Amino acid sequence: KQYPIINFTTAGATVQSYTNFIRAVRGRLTTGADVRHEIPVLPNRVGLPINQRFILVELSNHAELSVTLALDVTNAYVVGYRAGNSAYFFHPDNQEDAEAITHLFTDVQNRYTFAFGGNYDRLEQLAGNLRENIELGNGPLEEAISALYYYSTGGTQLPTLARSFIICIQMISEAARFQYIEGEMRTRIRYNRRSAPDPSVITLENSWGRLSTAIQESNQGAFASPIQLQRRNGSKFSVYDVSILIPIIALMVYRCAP
Numbered sequence: 287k288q289y290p291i292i293n294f295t296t297a298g299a300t301v302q303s304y305t306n307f308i309r310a311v312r313g314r315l316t317t318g319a320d321v322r323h324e325i326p327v328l329p330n331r332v333g334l335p336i337n338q339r340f341i342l343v344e345l346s347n348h349a350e351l352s353v354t355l356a357l358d359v360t361n362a363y364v365v366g367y368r369a370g371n372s373a374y375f376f377h378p379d380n381q382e383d384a385e386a387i388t389h390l391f392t393d394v395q396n397r398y399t400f401a402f403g404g405n406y407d408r409l410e411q412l413a414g415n416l417r418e419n420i421e422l423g424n425g426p427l428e429e430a431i432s433a434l435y436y437y438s439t440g441g442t443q444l445p446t447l448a449r450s451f452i453i454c455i456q457m458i459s460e461a462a463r464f465q466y467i468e469g470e471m472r473t474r475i476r477y478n479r480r481s482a483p484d485p486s487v488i489t490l491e492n493s494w495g496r497l498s499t500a501i502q503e504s505n506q507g508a509f510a511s512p513i514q515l516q517r518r519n520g521s522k523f524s525v526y527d528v529s530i531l532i533p534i535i536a537l538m539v540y541r542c543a544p
């Protein structure tokens with residue numbers, strides 16, 4: 287009757303504490319009973335009961351502020367958030383999703399649905415910057431938490447709210463989806479660095495649906511046609527088999543098997 291909550295703080299964050307956080311997120315996103323070619327699948331949206339539909343990620347910072355994100359277990363998407371007495375949700379893509387989000391944060395005094403949706407393309411337009419120009423790392427996360435916290439009081443400008451959602455989505459949902467992206471965030475934390483995601487990260491994020499489909503329709507792991515990804519330097523290279531992606535992709539959106 288209460289969605290599971292996973293907590294993380296940027297205060298004193300370490301490689302280990304962030305690893306533990308991502309590990310716990312993945313364990314609440316899916317039971318891992320459905321696995322294809324060794325890669326776990328998230329639950330199928332079709333028929334999933336509303337009491338199993340979301341998980342909550344509570345984020346706190348050194349500035350002593352806390353916000354709670356809500357993630358959809360079917361796709362790990364961030365659907366909205368709460369900060370004390372206000373909660374905000376991206377505009378839903380359909381009436382069923384609009385109904386499902388009514389079961390989030392039910393006791394909050396003030397609820398709002400943004401005019402805009404939450405996909406990267408729309409967020410980047412609102413932010414005035416692409417993912418490739420938005421730094422990630424503990425420093426960015428601590429600032430995003432504060433920016434989300436102050437939004438209900440009028441203190442946070444919309445382009446900074448959208449930048450702050452882009453940071454959270456990549457450092458939580460994308461890291462859950464891809465060990466490679468989790469590793470990129472671990473490296474930033476290890477060296478107290480803040481830097482934008484390189485093309486390898488961006489193209490993996492953009493490819494998640496396509497890779498979920500290609501792995502799940504594969505012939506014993508062999509892709510039906512090669513998929514082009516980007517190296518760190520922006521060069522394209524082909525992948526032909528799920529085997530090379532085992533240490534890279536952690537979760538997939540559901541597809542029916544062949």
Ligand SMILES: Nc1nc(=O)c2ncc(C(=O)O)nc2[nH]1
Nearest residue numbers: 362363364404405406407455459
């Ligand atoms: N809100 C949100 N949560 C996500 O996990 C997410 N992940 C991917 C994309 C995207 O490809 O455009 N947008 C997202 N937006």
